[PDB]
């Protein structure tokens, strides 16, 4: 009966508090985020 399966959707307040604590936490953590960025794309343009 229960499926509880709601909880995908609703992960929005988690998100954005998540990502909030998580940007205070770790400001840092965009650098991180650029490397990975920059060398995802650098992957990609031998991909086309």
Known sequence: ???SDLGY???TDEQA???HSVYM???WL???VA???HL???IWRPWF
């Open 40 to 42: 995802a794309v650098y």
């Open 17 to 19: 508090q998540e990502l």
């Open 1 to 3: 009966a229960d499926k």
């Open 25 to 27: 936490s770790g400001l």
């Open 9 to 11: 959707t609703g992960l």
């Open 35 to 37: 490397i990975v960025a």
């Open 30 to 32: 965009f650098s991180a």
